[PDB]
């Protein structure tokens, strides 16, 4: 099965999802000289404050935080977006060291991890219909650098020994997503794909341009979780990310100057 092993990792998905060497994967070095300020560009609208978690689990890839998606609880719309985009989970990609861990890169550089907030289309109905279609899903990106922690991540720290291994799942309410922003919401934007298989063409990407500060604690306590089952040989979660992909016939549009 597909992972991030030697055997199993990005430079073999394409033998299962041959989407994987697609017109529109992701993710992408931003070239932050060659993205283009685009005017046209509304102000993302993140609103968080009716958001519902439910459950965090660990499924031997990344660890989701997932919602209550049934309503319109926890939305984000505006930017490039048409219509209203539902918050269903989010996740993390991170490293084995401070100097790699994100899917996207600014101007080359690595940071020690990347948050995903995904959501999808309600036009669509379900989340699984909307990775069907290729403005199905929304996915905020926001870097992590290590420094000062983050007290809003804290909650999610803690809870990372009840899930070690694959298939471990916590319950996980009342935990509100808008701890975890920048205080800027300016973004780049394009259109990509999922960065796991099966590497579904769906997504508009929305990188924001700051990045939030994590302390080496909380980012140590990531790299604690396994990939493995419980009773299994540990395998430590650390370097589930994808590398950066070719940007083929695509535009970087920036919101800001
Ligand atoms: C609960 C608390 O942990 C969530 Se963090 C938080 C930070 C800022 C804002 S606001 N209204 O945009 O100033 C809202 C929420
Ligand atoms: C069977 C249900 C529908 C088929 Se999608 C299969 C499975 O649910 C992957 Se969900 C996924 C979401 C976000 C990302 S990312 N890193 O943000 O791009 C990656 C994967
Ligand atoms: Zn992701």
Same mark, same amino acid.
């Given at each position: 099965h597909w992972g =991030?092993? *030697? +055997?199993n990792g990005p430079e073999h998905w394409h033998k299962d999802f041959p989407i994987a060497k697609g017109?529109? &994967?992701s993710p992408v070095d931003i070239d932050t000289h060659t993205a283009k300020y685009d005017p046209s560009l509304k102000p993302l609208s993140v609103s968080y404050d009716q958001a519902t978690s439910l459950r965090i689990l660990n499924n031997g890839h990344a660890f989701n935080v997932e919602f209550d998606d049934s309503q $319109? *609880?926890?939305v984000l719309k505006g930017g490039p977006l048409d219509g209203t985009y539902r918050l269903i989970q989010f996740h993390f990609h991170w490293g084995?060291? $401070?100097g &790699?861990?994100?899917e +996207?890169?600014?101007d080359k550089k690595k940071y020690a991890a990347e948050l995903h907030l995904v959501h999808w289309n309600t *036009? =669509?109905?379900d989340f699984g219909k909307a990775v069907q279609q290729p403005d199905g899903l929304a996915v905020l990106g926001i870097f992590l650098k290590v420094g000062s922690a983050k007290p809003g991540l804290q909650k999610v720290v803690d809870v990372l020994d009840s899930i070690k291994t694959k298939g471990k799942s916590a319950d996980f309410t009342n935990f509100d997503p808008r701890g975890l922003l920048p205080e800027s919401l300016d973004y780049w934007t394009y259109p990509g794909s999922l960065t796991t298989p099966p590497l579904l063409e769906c997504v508009t990407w929305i990188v924001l341009k700051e990045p939030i500060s994590v302390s080496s604690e909380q980012v140590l306590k990531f790299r604690k979780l396994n990939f493995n089952g419980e009773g @299994?040989? @540990?395998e430590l979660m650390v370097d589930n990310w994808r590398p950066a992909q070719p940007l083929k016939n695509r535009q970087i549009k920036a919101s800001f100057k």
């Open positions: =991030y092993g *030697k +055997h017109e529109r &994967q $319109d *609880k926890a084995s060291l $401070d &790699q861990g994100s +996207h890169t600014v *036009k =669509y109905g @299994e040989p @540990e």
